[PDB]
Paper text:
Type III (Csm/Cmr) [name] systems utilise a cyclase domain in the Cas10 subunit to generate [name] (cOA) by polymerising ATP1–3. [name], hereafter Can1 ([name] ancillary nuclease 1), was identified as a potential accessory protein of the type III [name] system by Shah et al. in 2018 (cluster 107). Here, we show that Can1 is a metal dependent DNA nuclease, activated by cA4 binding. Once activated by cA4 generated in response to detection of foreign RNA, Can1 cleaves supercoiled DNA to generate nicked products.
Can1, with selenomethionine incorporated, was crystallised in the presence of cA4. Diffraction data were collected at Diamond Light Source to 1.83 Å resolution and phased using the incorporated selenium atoms. The protein chain is traced from residue 3 to 638, with three short sections too disordered to model (464-471, 491-494 and 530-539). The structure of Can1 is unique, with four distinct domains linked by flexible loops. At the N-terminus there is a CARF domain (residues 3-151), domain 2 (residues 168-276), a second CARF domain (residues 293-422) and a nuclease domain (residues 426-638). There are a fairly modest number of hydrogen bond interactions between Can1 and cA4 given its size, all but one of which originate from the two CARF domains. Can1 is unusual in being a monomeric protein with two non-identical CARF domains, and therefore possesses less intrinsic symmetry than most family members. cA4 is bound in a markedly asymmetrical conformation, which is in part exaggerated by the position of one adenine base in an axial position, driven by a stacking interaction with a tryptophan residue. The cA4 ligand is completely buried in the Can1 complex, demonstrating that significant protein conformational changes are required to facilitate binding. Modelling of dsDNA binding by the nuclease domain, coupled with the observation that conserved basic residues in the nuclease-like domain are essential for activity (presumably due to a role in DNA binding rather than directly in catalysis), suggests that cA4 binding allows the nuclease and nuclease-like domains to assemble into a functional dsDNA binding site, activating the enzyme.
Author numbering: 3 to 463, 472 to 490, 495 to 529, 540 to 638
Amino acid sequence: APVYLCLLGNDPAPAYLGLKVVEREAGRVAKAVFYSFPAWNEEYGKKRQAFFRLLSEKGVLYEERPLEKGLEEAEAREVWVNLTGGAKYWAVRFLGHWRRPGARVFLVEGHRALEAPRALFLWPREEERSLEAEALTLEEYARLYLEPLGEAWERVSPPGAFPPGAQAARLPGREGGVFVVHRGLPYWYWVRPHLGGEAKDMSRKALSAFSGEAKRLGGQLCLPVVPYHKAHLRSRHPKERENVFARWRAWAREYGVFLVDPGRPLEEEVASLIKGKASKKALPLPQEGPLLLALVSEQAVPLYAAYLHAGPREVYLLTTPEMESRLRWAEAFFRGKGVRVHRSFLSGPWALREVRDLLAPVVEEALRRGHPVHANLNSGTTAMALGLYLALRDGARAHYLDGDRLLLLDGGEAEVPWEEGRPEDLLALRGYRFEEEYPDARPDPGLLALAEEILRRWDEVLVRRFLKFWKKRFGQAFPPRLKGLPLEYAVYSHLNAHLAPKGGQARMGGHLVPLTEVDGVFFHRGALWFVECKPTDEGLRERAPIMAELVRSVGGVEARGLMVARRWRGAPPPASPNLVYMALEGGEGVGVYRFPEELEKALSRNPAPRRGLE
RNA sequence: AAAA
């Protein structure tokens, strides 16, 4: 009987799907071996145990092994190797090793909305097939995702907006959504069934929370589908209607929600997102090195790291039509840095062979002409990244950012010149213009004393003497809203003293304008941080839910939020995996760190960015 | 991490 060899990351669903594929084609497996990465949080840990429970019910013996142990000869005559799981770095390394007799190597690719996942066989023959039959059912998702999270559920009729064949469940403990499984993929679909729910305005708070909720319930590719409240729009003045709708659209883009017309089938809404983009031409051959080749996808930091490392004169960017906005912002970023940009669209996220065929000639020409060729392997789907790897030839320089350092695919690590990074550049790459409120503010000992003076005497009606020294030292005047400025300047000053020595960059507050307000921002070693400054723990508690989603969506997976109070009083801060809570005074012995004395301690309790592959 |  065949043996299943499988990279295992946070989500058990692609691992399970790959097992169903093997079982359908080859029958009962002798055993499964999982090369597992540590689960990123307790919920994923629980989902993984649910997966192992399912394997046990399936009569499938399994074991977990370190990744390196997967780079050895097979014991069984026939192995099926699934490379979808975990970091694409390991897919690349396993693909090198497992292209051998006695092995079938494949991926499962489910990143196009409303399609069934595909199997891409890479070895011994390139083949692709639709996984309509093997697609996970609602019940399979319930036992892998919902049961381990303690979510009760019951089957309900699916929303009419889905194509035929969808299955759905209501979660009585989770108001406001329906969990829909369609052709093997999960969707968290917004419903407001209570009378006049659809006639109310939609909030930034509810939209952001819905996106986080979708990701907790259904994982990384669970699409939050939100039919907008057209009845509310019809209740508006025509001008206000345009304003309201624009706000919803902006919020939905910001938190990763798929905002849809309730009057249309989802198939049409998805088609509109991908329509009219087909690229016709090959990529122009390179004229000037160095070159950077990269995919474009949700995380901007790896692409930015690649830019800092490679210092390219030409960049080649490939992605899918559904990532058109991100591609547009990446192109603008690189053009703004004087880099020649070439871009093309793939037919879809499965298009490994398109990436390979688009890039092979560019690589070959570059190597002929002696242009250094850098290839970043962080972005796109595993299919896309493997496509890029397969375009490479001896001499190419492939890397993968692992938190704060680049892993070199042929061995060794590159330290990134992070000291050359700027938070405003990262944000541009991501799709935002950071409009600073205090661009010329810099650290100044005397102005800091004043600010700190004010902070001791916060019982308020000196503030005029602060604003006057601000005018003097920075040339900035204000017309007769600045109450938060003393805390913001103090926080910025101590951040800057802590970070500058170490190559980090700190900034004061302003507006994140899509191409939301913050009290500060800093970038250090592959993690962006947004800062929120409040008089009390009370302002921070109220801000935390939205801040956590802003940090995640706009800052990225390794981003964090620094929450600083002048005075901490109440209970310990609420559980926040991506926020850090500090205070000038108070909160000793309730988890809250002391600012600025315990900065080092606070920023390294859970180091950002995380290294996954040490 | 199923598009670090």
